């Protein structure tokens, strides 16, 4: 966690001070400020010996935690309807879930084949979508007119499920 | 617009059919299913010329329009308001909007100098923010605990506006 050679000399000099007293992890932390300012630049790489931020991690953060989301211009949320309401397509897998239950209803189409983001752009601006979300596992879900927001976080879409 | 050379064959052989007859532009299309299946592969390609998509770009995308959004694991709320509240750092903007708006009060955090994405993560890491945005202009817009979403849109983080 701690990386104890870079930040022993200067975290000390903090504690002989007695800075960073006070831990966020239960109740209010009066000192934070205080023990950042002390840090200063070190405060990134220095945070999780005083407690003041989580040990450098432990997990392999999956890719697909990231995504990238971008608002098509120009939205055409007629022609998003036509082509899903029908028999769907193949390549396309089409969910529709309650709208805010990522944070009436909303609806997103979950390209099957893993395609490049740039792909994925095209494919859903041909769609009509108002918006399109691009999982960095290279999964892309096209966004429906309704839905308020970028859609399921989920990588729900069949044949790129890399990342779990 | 329309790729005549690509496109005038197969696009022709649709019309001949009398598919792609009705406009999603105003009232509902019909026809539009039926059209993509007549277009097949080249839908993406060429559904611009039966006017059933946008054409192909007129403008040329800002960078910033493109964002990458994560959420942060063991998010740390107690410490993301002790250093938003008092005499914030100069290298930080502090912008607290009210919730909902992008779509009680949403607040993030704009940093200054525009970095990368892995920085932008880190430094968000050991604010203890939720979540953390990043803009493909590279300006890094961390994410408070109280927000519901992502928070703005906007690139409002002073010394990265490249973009606008």
């Given at each position: 966690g701690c990386n104890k050679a870079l930040?022993?000399?200067?975290?000390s000099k903090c504690l002989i001070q007695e800075l960073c007293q006070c831990r966020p992890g239960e109740g209010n932390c009066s000192c934070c400020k205080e023990c950042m300012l002390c840090l200063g630049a070190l405060w990134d790489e220095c945070c999780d010996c005083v407690g003041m931020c989580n040990p450098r991690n432990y997990s392999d953060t999956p890719p697909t935690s990231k995504s990238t989301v971008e608002e098509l211009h120009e939205p055409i949320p007629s022609l998003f309807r036509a082509l899903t309401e029908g028999d769907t397509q193949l390549n396309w897998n089409?969910?529709?879930?309650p709208v805010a239950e990522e944070l009436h209803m909303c609806t997103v189409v979950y390209f099957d084949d893993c395609m490049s983001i740039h792909q994925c752009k095209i494919s859903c601006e041909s769609m009509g979508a108002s918006k399109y979300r691009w999982f960095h596992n290279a999964c892309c879900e096209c966004i429906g007119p309704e839905c308020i927001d970028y859609g399921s976080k989920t990588v729900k879409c069949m044949n790129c499920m890399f990342g779990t």
């Amino acid at each position: 966690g701690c990386n104890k050679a870079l930040c022993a000399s200067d975290v000390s000099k903090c504690l002989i001070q007695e800075l960073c007293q006070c831990r966020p992890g239960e109740g209010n932390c009066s000192c934070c400020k205080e023990c950042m300012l002390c840090l200063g630049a070190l405060w990134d790489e220095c945070c999780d010996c005083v407690g003041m931020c989580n040990p450098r991690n432990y997990s392999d953060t999956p890719p697909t935690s990231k995504s990238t989301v971008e608002e098509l211009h120009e939205p055409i949320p007629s022609l998003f309807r036509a082509l899903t309401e029908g028999d769907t397509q193949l390549n396309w897998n089409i969910v529709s879930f309650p709208v805010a239950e990522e944070l009436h209803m909303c609806t997103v189409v979950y390209f099957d084949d893993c395609m490049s983001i740039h792909q994925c752009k095209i494919s859903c601006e041909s769609m009509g979508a108002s918006k399109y979300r691009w999982f960095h596992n290279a999964c892309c879900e096209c966004i429906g007119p309704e839905c308020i927001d970028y859609g399921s976080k989920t990588v729900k879409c069949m044949n790129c499920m890399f990342g779990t």
